[model samples]
Target chain A: SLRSDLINALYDDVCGIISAEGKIYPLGSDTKVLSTIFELFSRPIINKIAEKHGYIVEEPKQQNHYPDFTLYKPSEPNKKIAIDIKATYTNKENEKIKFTLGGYTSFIRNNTKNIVYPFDQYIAHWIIGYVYTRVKTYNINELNEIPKPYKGVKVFLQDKWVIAGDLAGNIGSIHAHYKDFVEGKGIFDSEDEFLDYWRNYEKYNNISEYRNWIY
Target chain B: SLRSDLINALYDVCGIISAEGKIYPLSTIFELFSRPIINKIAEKHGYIVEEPKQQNHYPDFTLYKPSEPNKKIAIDIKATYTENEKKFTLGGYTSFIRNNTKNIVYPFDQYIAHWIIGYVYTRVKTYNINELNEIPKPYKGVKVFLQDKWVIAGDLAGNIGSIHAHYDFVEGKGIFDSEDEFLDYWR
Candidate 1:
């Protein structure tokens, strides 16, 4: 799809930047700071690629909207692509990272009342995942004090997936489905299957394994 | 039927051990290490203690006073790693609530109290988490202090089955004072 191509291009740009920089650290260890740093770095690269590809890129006017950026194809501007960037810290012990699919209410509603509407029928509702290795104290005065490679402070470009492929929590709660996603489990075959599962998840509860998804 | 004084005594002894900067190698080590200390303290105070025969049963220990030999009080020790401003999961969702019944588990009320201990001493850092022979230094770079926050097992008021309500409960509510105040809502 056009959405898939744009995402792949974005990922390539991110990896290219990191490879050239040698190492990149969060502006600060705060989660918000790290996310902002990633988003800020992504915007220009995304715009440049959009220009090259003759696609129009627009930012959401409201900060609270889903899909941080909207990609509109000149041929079919009405059919827009929704892209949300998500980042999480890797577990020091397990070397794994987990993130929420969406808030309980947010997921249940299947609605983002912005220009990127009709989430289920959207051209594409994509998520770009980033996993960072470590967070540490650094001197604020020192400019570009990248965490040494020995410290294992780095980021990985986790894969992008359609939201419907992910499962919703039993009561529309945030899901830690990254584990299952990485494990090749809990993925739905189609948008209809995912919506049905979300609507009729009570049957899946008490399975122990499916507790997070169903209960 | 156990008196409040005896409950407080148990809490005090556990609290002192926690405050003394005693690191028992791992958080799991607390239960094994505390059993002897709890038993000795009980015996010293004229109380008899016994362990349940069933391996998977609730309540780690049962105690009876000499004056009331037949009246047993169930006590279980629990610990959680504290993070982000005095927060910890009190216990697992299944352990506290029954899925089949959509209610609190039968043994929850059977237990007189839970000594919900918060291990503020350390935030786990190492990649080798399975190697638990050493008490990893506190993440805050200081001696760890255990806070003794007791909860009445029966007093757990609300059902945790409702995901929306349960998420909120897990996030905020459910703080307890005296183990007595902890149990005021069970019925």
Candidate 2:
């Protein structure tokens, strides 16, 4: 019941972040992380919602790590939920949301350095995807008076498999579409189908050891 | 110069780093770099920004303050990977600049300024881009500068005789003496 409630809480409570008086450094999208410096700005509420749920939240120790948050309770070490936060903007010109998920080959296939827990330890994987419209900002010298850089924030919480498309996104990661997210859509008929397609991406691309992954 | 301010803003928000510590050389720069800088400048000044409704549209971005509905500016973001900087190919001149009715967001004359913010960056392929986890930068550098369409104008042709604005560069030069010369020569 609370898992569904968590979705509602995120949908109800999530919104734009304050620019923080420029104290926090703004990071650009040039790297593999979220392109906006706003990612750090907007993450507090995401953490806050999990904290409110009494989940012991853990952060990634590595720069390039999996699971933005590893939420669990002390009573059940085995029962953990992996939540990854993703954000993107929408434009009328594009027909879909079209954002990258994660690598199909990383933690899912190998339970090693990239993850906080073993590949099979987490009971569920959920993605909190934020879709927002970037505000048209100006007056660079007056950074203090600026309103938050994003507006019309919309969010969706879904099983990572349910939202993932069969296609590979820009960075050779699982692809996601706009309708499958905001409009409550999913391209694959079932989670198993998403798994089969993405896991075999290496096979399709003629890479080595594609057959090694069993899950 | 005030232009320095724009480049400084760009530097803070550039680079394509991944969670794995890999920095990918950007083949296309608009989504990650150009659009954000344009909107950052627009929203701060209270000018409402309108992006192109279609692909390959004349102006990349259009700006107009609601208070001054008739006043407008057009910015075209164009990037060229700098193996060499002898020539820069720009947008079609025959379309919006001449026809005034095709591929433009608004009437050509209503635009107060048509700016082409140019960028030149060398694609660093020799080094292991994935190995850049140890070093944040792998590419040589990125060159970002802003100038009006006339300031960089070369010949009336780009990509074709009249299809594009061909700006032959001496590394710093434009063929035209003024914006008037640019408009009339292209016409």
Candidate 3:
């Protein structure tokens, strides 16, 4: 209820600033991704521009075998596929779910002796979610200790390529959460699927596709 | 000893960076002036040559009598000038010592009282004894503390003025001891 009140206050303030023609100005070229990210997605994840033409983004995911989201060409229906996001945030109970996905990937690679498939066409991937400003207090090391997509590195991993996708200066500022996305190391060429999935993110909060096990 | 070792290590590793022909690097300027304040004036005070010589090239105060060449110990003196000297001016101590010693290191066009601290305080950081030795109240006979570590609190309650007379036996108000007492204390 307190958080709800805070969000309500924030929305009200945003309405005032918008009325006054005041919009968030990003710091640098790197941070420009914020504006780009907030434009495409919802809640936490958004698509941001990086490199030449390829964009970087992040998508909160359900703990599953494949990554939370995938990268695909928005223009081309089926071209240039890549793994995008990984579920690194959820607390302890969600951690067990994370391990389950990790085990599934390891099982397919070592035991099954074959590459895994999803959606009958997309490739499975390990998405390293780079959650910036996860916490404050100048302790940069402690702030990003988890949701590490790579191996060995408790922060920046090497095995699983992670992108500093979802980023902005003031995590508490309005319009700061904009256009956050990434590519490669996961789902290959699935931008449309990601867009659709992100657009309807509200549905995943309460219910799940596989609901037989628990409420 | 531990602090000495720590500072030395920092100097060796962080102070110098490897370049093509030789190791060339630097340290933060603020760190340089944090150590001793007296010797910093004695050995390193100088004129500006790196950049097109500015007005600061002129020395503020020279040690010893202005006209007497015999006591013209300019080598171990400090001279400075500042724009806000009139407002933030501190001359009673620097003046007293210089005048009694017959020195001339004091306010001038380029070397004003206000500009001295900031310009010289942040110049050296290494730990050295020469840099540690107090600039004794080398005046005629006035003893004072111009080498406070954390905050520069001059001695004998003459924290910020020029000295004029010997304060020996001047009671609690002064810092001087009788000649015999001074000798005994030093011994």
Candidate 4:
């Protein structure tokens, strides 16, 4: 039930970016795809941090590429920017986005570049939607946080820069959405933020036995 | 003219390797073209390095790339050097082969990997040798040494990837006697 709730929440969050103000927005298919990816990656990253504490989060609507996610844990007074996320959408028919990303991430060599994206464009009232067949959840302990595993691992290189899914390491696909969700509160806030972080999460947590799920 | 001497030296080196009874000898035709081109690039890289040495104690064989030419002197120096300024650098080159024979020779002018490839592309004989390893022990040096020993770190798609050049750098050896040794080694 929690798993279904999470994926649905992700879809709703992503869909809000695509369909804003009861009118479809004006972006290329690649931009639409990038929004989906950013929302998905950011949500989980935030949620995991919240889960560490006893609170919950859905996802934060960030500017297009802001400083990672600005997370406000209950105990910490200042909202911490978790990890920075950049949107690099590609539509080239024959190009290695993986190698390109690997070579170009040097743009983030230091903390001067702004996020090409922010979190708020997608959510207004903030209930989002998700589309997955089933959701897979892993216990917080069995994660792998190696450099390649978390950051440099080769991701999918479609016309858009979407990474392939890890069946077990991520929430398995289930078509779902959220209802009556606040802008940044509870698991809803944490979920999208955490998903976003997972897409590019490089924190060195206890990660040795993390497994990729395949059905 | 260390620059001119170096250019002539590269061609001469090709000649020596070609005349020697090795499998990966230089090609008769490609040598006509490639030597001048590579010699020019190598000379330019070398001259900039040598000019500064006139004022300061600079090493002879630096291998910095054009991208970071301003910094990181890519010279090859024997750990100890008490050279009389009158002696030529070739003597140092030979001494290098004697001491660091197992390791790839770094050059003042070019990346060792580029030098190796440049040497191979000098002629179809060398090129084919790289393609096939029929003749064994083409050179006194090892291919692996060229890669493992050189610090330049880009994954270059090796063009002459034949047995003649398919040396495992860590092993410090090639299986081909001459470029055409492919007929012998590939079988």
Candidate 5:
């Protein structure tokens, strides 16, 4: 019940954050994507939520590690949780957004130490997935009045497999199609099916730990 | 003819590059064309452009004469926003600056000269939401300047951050009087 309350709360608090409707503060222009801008604004909200709930949070020591955030209760030392904040966008309407769900070879496949804790340590792997659409550029009136680069924001929080698809994002990383996230039509029936498909995926198949991994 | 050969080309370009092309209209537009054109021009002047084999290496384009292949002139393109009117970030001090062969294609000491071709520009509103075609260029006005590494560079940017140049004084108003002074502060 707390988990349900938290996700919805997180979602509600974050919905209006990216509209960026203040003075002439520049964002989401040039080569910058709205997802990056979303993450920048969204991270503070997460910090606030964690503080309110008496949850302690730790950031990965390295930039290339898994789990954008590691949060837990100090009393519940053995039971930690990871939430990867993923943001993506599609320019036109009616298109699904996708995120490169980190490296398959790292935490999931090899149990690499790149993650904050051992793979089996965390009790849950959650995602705060955000999506947006781009506003047109090159149509302006005043130098300080550029329209915001993103709008119509949507966010979701779910178990990692709930929104995962069977695509190798860019070779080694897992990819979740927008259909699974924005459309809520995930391909996998359950976590085991998702794990088996990816663990036994094309050409690189040595993982025999399907139906076994807890976290 | 550093100004005649380089700065003039850019002054002529700001009027042209933004007018046409699938433009995003931003400072990165300079990044888009700076490397290739800088290399092409250097080669046209009979200097071989010794490009770094890796990314994030110093000297966006390295110039060398085959006559003395050992000598190298490093030319790194630097950029900053006018909103802050800041100095150029040379690169991470932890990389090739620490060890000659860390992230650079060649040893750092092989460089006989290091020059910065820097720009100061304001990010502007170039596009509107309603009229969604033929985007106006972003970055309304820009000033480009060139200075030798010795005369322009001063200290690390606050912390163990990137080595920073004397703010875009554009007129060589750097604090360092000589190369040793610059190197002594940084090295």
Candidate 6:
């Protein structure tokens, strides 16, 4: 019943945490900051919420590969489910929002090493997104913190169907593509539909060349 | 004169100006930075540059050679953040649709050429409204060179084209070397 309880209570719990303590200090490209912030609040709270039902939460060791955490009963290893935490912000140009979904090759390979744990068997692969927006041009040194109204970043929780369904396009790298919940296209009927698309991703009509000019 | 010739000449002028280190403040608006330079170049080339009498005309300025008084080329100016990502939102959405799809606005077909001049620059991001209410007029802070790029705004069928898809910029290479090559990319 811990699985069901987590499913029911996760959104409210994350929202409450953000409301209580979230403050604006620009994190820049250090995305790990958001995940750590979520865990700082959500981990203990989730453990407490699920403790009576005998389900314990965990922080997985494979930081780069897949889900950030695993939740399961020690007695039943097969019951474990995965959760990946992500954060994103909107640029000044439009309502466009961008976030990475790990590397492309990792997701596309389909090899066991690349595949996430309990891929087909877990309740679902969960994602919690914190979306925020900032000014296009701002002096870095002028302010130590983002001003009041803009400080709070919003949170969203979704499963594979809702997440992959909203996949807009790639960010011009082997890394991750962007998703637009604001511009939801349509949902994949099943996990298979999602995997099939990723495997043959280059065939999609909208998949164009993306180049990050960092080099 | 051919539109290509005029476009090449404008590029040469902009290149010269930028090369001369004619620095402008980061806060300089597009109209203020671009119009005077455009006018100077057109005049130096013996082209008549005039604002349309109708306030809401499509193109911001009209240019023509005195020898061929009947031939008028339309020029519109557009500006975007210098550090923009690969794609940018091309505003003027409704105007673009009305002009291109419905043919309900502007005589886009009448002009021998439709030119769009883009000014790209790094803007000063920080500002305070109240700290020094007495910052003197024509204030100067850090300055930046306004880089200019231009593109034709029509397709072979002669409608306002989507510049985001057609125009491409390479850091070392600059804008596409020629219009034919630019057109070929979309081909």
Q: Identify the candidate with maximal lDDT.
A: 5
The lDDT for every candidate, in the order shown, is: 0.43, 0.57, 0.24, 0.28, 0.58, 0.44
Per-prediction TM-score of chain B?
0.45, 0.73, 0.19, 0.21, 0.73, 0.46
Worst ten-residue run, lDDT, model 3 chain B? B11-20
- Residue pairs in clash, model 1: A104-A172, B121-B144, B122-B138
DockQ of each: 0.02, 0.03, 0.01, 0.01, 0.06, 0.01
Can you write out model 1's per-residue Cα lDDT over B1-187, one digit (the tens) per residue? 1233433443101110111122121143345434655676677667677765543454456666757644445554554433443333344345443432232233454444344322333354111112223433324321212222342233332421111122122232344555565433322
Error of 5 at A55 (Å): 1.7
The DockQ value obtained for model 6 is: 0.01
| Candidate 4 regions with alpha-carbon error over 4 angstroms | A1-33, A40-66, A72-81, A86-96, A99-215, B1-187
Off by over 4 Å in 1: A1-28, A104-115, A136-141, A144-186, A199-203, A206-215, B1-187
Model 5 docking grade: incorrect
Stretches of candidate 6 exceeding 4 Å from the true structure: A1-4, A7-39, A91-98, A114-118, A121-123, A135-150, A165-185, A206-215, B1-187
Better of 1 and 4 by lDDT: 1
- Per-residue lDDT of model 5, residues A61-153, tens digit only: 776677888888888878888888776666765764577576666567767558988877788888787767666122212333444456566
Highest-DockQ candidate = 5
Q: In CAPRI terms, where does candidate 2 land?
A: incorrect
Interface RMSD of 6: 23.3
RMSD of each: 15.5, 14.0, 27.7, 25.7, 11.3, 17.4
DockQ-sorted candidate list, best first? 5, 2, 1, 6, 4, 3
Segments in model 5 whose C-alpha atoms lie over 4 Å from true places: A13-25, A136-144, A170-179, A182-184, A202-215, B1-187
Candidate 1 per-residue lDDT over residues A36-114, each given as its tens digit: 5456546665677677778887776765666677777778767776666666665473544455544434543546444
What digit string (tens of lDDT, one per residue) describes model 6 on residues B48-155?
Answer: 777654434556666778677556666666544433433222224344333542321235444555555554443321112321222222322212221222243223
User: Which parts of model 3 are misplaced by more than 4 Å?
Assistant: A1-46, A50-65, A79-101, A105-120, A123-126, A129-215, B1-187
Name the candidate that leads on TM-score: 5
Q: Is candidate 1 or candidate 3 better by TM-score?
A: 1
Give residue B150's lDDT in candidate 6 (0 to 100). 29
Better of 1 and 5 by lDDT: 5
Ranking by TM-score: 5, 2, 1, 6, 4, 3
